[PDB]
Design a protein around this ligand. Sequence first.
Ligand SMILES: [K+]
Ligand SMILES: [Mg+2]
Ligand SMILES: [Mg+2]
Ligand SMILES: [Mg+2]
Ligand SMILES: [Mg+2]
Ligand SMILES: [Mg+2]
Ligand SMILES: [Mg+2]
Ligand SMILES: [Mg+2]
Ligand SMILES: [Mg+2]
Ligand SMILES: [Mg+2]
Ligand SMILES: [Zn+2]
Lengths: 46, 154, 50, 110
Amino acid sequence: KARGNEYQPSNIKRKNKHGWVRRLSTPAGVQVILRRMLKGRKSLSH
Amino acid sequence: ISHGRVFRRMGLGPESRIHLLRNLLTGLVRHERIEAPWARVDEMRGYAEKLIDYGKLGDTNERAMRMADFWLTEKDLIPKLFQVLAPRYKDQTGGYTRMLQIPNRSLDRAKMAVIEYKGNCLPPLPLPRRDSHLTLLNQLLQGLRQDLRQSQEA
Amino acid sequence: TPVARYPPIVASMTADSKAARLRRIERWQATVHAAESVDEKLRILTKMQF
Amino acid sequence: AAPKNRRTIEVNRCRRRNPQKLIKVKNNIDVCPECGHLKQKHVLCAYCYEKVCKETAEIRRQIGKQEGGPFKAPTIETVVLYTGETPSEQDQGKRIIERDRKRPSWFTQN
RNA sequence: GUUCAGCUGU
RNA sequence: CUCCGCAUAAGCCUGCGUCAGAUUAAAAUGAACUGACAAUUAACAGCCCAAUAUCUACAAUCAACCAACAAGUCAUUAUUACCCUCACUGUCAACCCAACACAGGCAUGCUCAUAAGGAAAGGUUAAAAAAAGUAAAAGGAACUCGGCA
RNA sequence: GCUACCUAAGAACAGCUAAAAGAGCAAGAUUUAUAGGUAGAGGCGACAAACCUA
Ligand SMILES: [K+]
Ligand SMILES: [Mg+2]
Ligand SMILES: [Mg+2]
Ligand SMILES: [Mg+2]
Ligand SMILES: [Mg+2]
Ligand SMILES: [Mg+2]
Ligand SMILES: [Mg+2]
Ligand SMILES: [Mg+2]
Ligand SMILES: [Mg+2]
Ligand SMILES: [Mg+2]
Ligand SMILES: [Zn+2]
């Protein structure tokens, strides 16, 4: 019956899923950081 | 259609209506002069008059005490009713309260009234006063009245 | 020859006021005086965790 | 139902400026004899009423001090006495409220 | 399971 | 009126404390907006542990009796090594995910009807239509795709 | 971080017949918090061809 409440915030999940260490863990994630660095993102990751 | 419907619909329903009037009546007895929306003061005025009549029955009267107990939420007022208000009006047969419209209140522009128990200590309200007898129109009518006396005497 | 029976001059038990709350505090304290055993007394005095 | 067409300003002025929409001039306004301020004939003067309420509030504050608590309504009549006044024989055996002020001219001792 | 009996401003 | 409430966890991150304001809510006191100032103090909680070998058949259920089956959260010793002390961090709020008429969602402990927490009515009038509720003569599913038990 | 299934280690469940325990009225093929796993030529599915943050 609830709508639009997909987000159930969890800091452990947020860091583990999208964190800095997670991004560096694989080459694709490292390229994610590189793209954001190129674009000049203020936040490269969570 | 509301032909012959003497009572107003107020608050959240019948029971809420009585409680709203009871709270206004309780405030009037304690303070002897309150100001509230005109329609609510007008609706409560009848109960204010009748409450004095029950007070005249006396505290010994069981039915009167039951009425005062229900209508007066603050119990210290019950002695005031029987021992102060009722004796004050012992001579009068009615007209215990006076109700006057006051300016609309600022917030919601509601029509407002002031109601008091006649004979309270508080400073007198600026009652409306009829024109002086000494005015030009009243003097012409005073002369006419005097002549009708002479004609009636003859 | 009856006398005048007035209602006691106490605060309302259900009103939203300071005196009404003090009368409701006297109401639960009256159940501790009415409690027979000591267990019942201790239960009432310590069941509200704040 | 959605509007079929935009209403023109010409049509809207006729609606908005119709006499039925205009504020009516009031003819019951008058001048209060006591204070000289404006009032309506059937309504108490706002200036005079506020004057009574101001004094009434001070008296009620004095009544509160004497009672000194709730549910202490007295069982006798009350009389207000201003500075320089003494209890009358009629005003004897009554709760006395003392106001640190001269009796207002409009407020007449009875 | 119906019919029936019973109740309801349907 | 109570539909809750208080606390913890999770989330959130200063988000109704003081002062001031020309800002703001329907509201020129309030203020959750703006400026300045202040604040949550560890005992609760988080943050733990020397090595090598070795040990660990007997559920829980008031565990006793009578029983089982889906067969179960709870344990060491030996020798070596080791003299030192109370750091660091969380601690505020009217709070979160949502929806934008609470539409709704939300773990645990305690209270089991409150000692805690709250206000359905801006004022009036009392037309229709509409929504909900209550009462209803006689009849009691008749007239209706199809009532209820 | 929705949802489906699964893994780890947790938690919850008044009374009433109550032998039998069972969605009987009102303890289970139950519900539920936390972390993790399975990814689009795919995953997952007591299979709606559904669901996998519209
Ligand atoms: K916050
Ligand atoms: Mg039938
Ligand atoms: Mg400790
Ligand atoms: Mg705290
Ligand atoms: Mg309270
Ligand atoms: Mg309201
Ligand atoms: Mg109304
Ligand atoms: Mg309204
Ligand atoms: Mg009928
Ligand atoms: Mg038929
Ligand atoms: Zn005047």
